[PDB]
């Protein structure tokens, strides 16, 4: 039951390094659109009940099961709606660490289009919008060429695959905002407004995009959908543990010897993940200061914990952390953690949409405190303070960006308190002592700006 190192026959994607070309005939040789006509002719209930048997959790970072997510979409009187239902593919990633979905779309744009049709058939969707990042220009160009190849083959369009089912994939490109990664902010950005998230109890499966029902799925969990309908749920359910099933693309980045992107099993050890497929760590296992599984929005695992931890949802929720997008950002021992998490807090200050008051007023305060703690201009208590001002943002916001901006600060305070105390004692004996807020006894407000203090 040694989890990890699956065979080459057991990988879902085969283009992940570009040995085989992204061509449509190359996708036929890969095995795409081989039985889609028969799959569309199958009922939606069979597709939903097959994806419930797989244990397909959500690959966007939330983790929510995709069979249950796709089944909430049909209450038994959906036919009385008598209109268009839309599917939305979240191909926007900007999560620091991950490259996996750019690797979906550049390498294999065709299993995306296939999974769009299959997941639209599962929920009786009339059309589908793929939301590409506006930075990703060449990715959007390659996807548009591949969707045009799918129109020319007749596998998509007014009569998809000779089955009497209409389906249109359009492309929307989002000009550089990361809060539009959230599903409801994504819906509003497709609606043509500014991309702000909305509140929860109008659920989007009930009433969503254009005032019509719509769900928002990650581009990877849609690109996995045709092969998992072909290979079966019993084959996918064998990998991983009992609730965390299957495989996942891992983007291993940061300061490893060889940064890479693999696709390997869930519930695998982190040491066998970093050692066997990415060179090692630059300096060995002695040279591990910390690791961030997932994107920016995950607390750090310290050195003694990350030896025997598995890469599923359970073994990271048990260590009060998240799997997220399974980006693995390791942090070098010769690098500083405080500079890193200062940069994470500056990221969340730049990327917040600014609608609700605790998130918007909070990440500016988190940046003003982390610059000060990186310089060292504080008292020993103000990091217990910073813990409390993490806790007050953490759960009072519209979307989970306030929840996301809380967590790395909390992981820093839980795992690297003496690393902060050392910098603060360093500032206390290089120059004079400091009051609350960074004020020194020489510091006075002259005309215009403040002098006497070095202004972090």
């Amino acid at each position: 039951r040694q989890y990890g190192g699956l065979k080459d026959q057991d990988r879902i994607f085969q283009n992940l390094y570009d040995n085989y070309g992204w061509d449509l005939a190359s996708a036929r040789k890969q095995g795409d659109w081989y039985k889609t006509k028969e799959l569309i002719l199958k009922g939606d209930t069979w597709i939903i009940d097959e994806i419930k048997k797989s244990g397909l959790r959500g690959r966007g970072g939330a983790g929510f099961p995709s069979g249950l997510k796709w089944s909430f979409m049909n209450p038994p009187g959906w036919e009385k709606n008598e209109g268009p239902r839309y599917l939305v593919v979240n191909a926007d990633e900007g999560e620091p660490g991950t490259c996996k979905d750019r690797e979906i779309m550049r390498k294999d744009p065709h299993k995306l289009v296939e999974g769009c049709l299959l997941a639209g058939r599962a929920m009786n969707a009339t059309a589908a919008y793929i939301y590409i990042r506006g930075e990703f220009y060449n990715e959007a160009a390659v996807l548009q060429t591949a969707i045009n190849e799918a129109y020319a083959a007749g596998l998509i369009g007014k009569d998809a695959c000779g089955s009497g089912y209409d389906f249109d994939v359009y492309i929307h490109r989002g000009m550089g905002a990361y809060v539009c990664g959230e599903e409801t902010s994504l819906i509003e950005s497709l609606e043509g407004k500014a991309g702000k998230p909305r509140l929860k109890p109008p659920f989007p499966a009930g009433v969503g995009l254009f005032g019509r029902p719509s769900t928002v799925t990650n581009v990877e969990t849609v690109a996995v959908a045709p092969t998992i309908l072909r290979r079966g749920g019993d084959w996918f359910a064998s990998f991983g543990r009992e609730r965390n099933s299957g495989t996942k693309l891992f983007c291993i980045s940061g300061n490893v010897n060889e940064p890479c992107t693999v696709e390997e099993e869930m519930s695998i050890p982190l040491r066998e993940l970093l050692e066997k497929h990415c060179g090692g760590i630059k300096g060995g296992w002695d040279n591990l200061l910390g690791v961030i599984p997932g994107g920016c929005s995950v607390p750090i695992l310290p050195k003694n914990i990350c030896e025997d931890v598995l890469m599923d949802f359970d073994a990271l929720k048990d260590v009060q952390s998240g799997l997220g997008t399974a980006a693995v950002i390791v942090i070098n021992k010769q690098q500083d953690v405080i500079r890193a998490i200062q940069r994470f807090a500056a990221f969340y200050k730049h990327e917040s949409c600014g609608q609700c008051t605790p998130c918007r007023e909070g990440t500016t305060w988190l940046l003003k405190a982390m610059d000060r703690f990186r310089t060292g201009q504080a008292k020993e208590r103000e990091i217990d303070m910073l813990y409390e001002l993490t806790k007050d943002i953490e759960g009072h916001t519209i979307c989970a960006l306030g929840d996301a901006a809380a967590w790395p600060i909390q992981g820093l305070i839980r795992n690297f308190r003496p690393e902060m105390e050392t910098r603060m004692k360093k500032f206390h004996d290089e120059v004079g002592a400091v009051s609350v807020g960074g004020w020194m006894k020489d510091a006075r407000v002259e005309k215009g700006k403040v002098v006497g203090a070095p202004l972090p």
Binding site: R381, E382, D384, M385, Y387, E388, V436
Partner: protein, 121 residues
């Protein structure tokens, strides 16, 4: 300032406000004392069959029994336990902190003997 109040991060104010934690006037009618004599108390409830106990409460709440009838129906143990003291004596008018006096007589007094003023401590 003192330490658990000037503290920058551990207290919230709602734990340490006491203006908003003021207690209320315990206003007691004559009929709620009949309730306390016949239903009982929360320390010693003399009520069984709670679904019928609400109906047993309700006629007193509407004015079924009277207060003199409540005193007459009440047992001698109830009268000597909760109305009177346990020995059967009336309760003394209560004081918060009792003061026991001690007259200072000798050379530690403020006036010596022969002056009509005494020190009482």
């Amino acid at each position: 300032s003192s330490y658990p109040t000037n503290d920058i991060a551990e207290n919230p104010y709602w734990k340490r406000d006491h203006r908003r934690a003021y207690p209320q006037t315990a206003f007691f009618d004559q009929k709620t004392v009949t309730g306390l004599l016949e239903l009982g108390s929360e320390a010693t409830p003399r009520i069984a069959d709670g679904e019928a106990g609400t109906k047993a409460l309700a006629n007193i709440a509407n004015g079924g029994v009277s207060f003199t009838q409540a005193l007459g129906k009440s047992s001698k143990d109830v009268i000597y336990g909760e109305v009177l003291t346990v020995n059967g004596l009336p309760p003394v008018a209560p004081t918060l902190a009792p003061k026991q006096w001690k007259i200072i007589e000798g050379e530690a007094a403020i006036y010596p003997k022969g002056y009509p003023c005494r020190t009482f401590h």
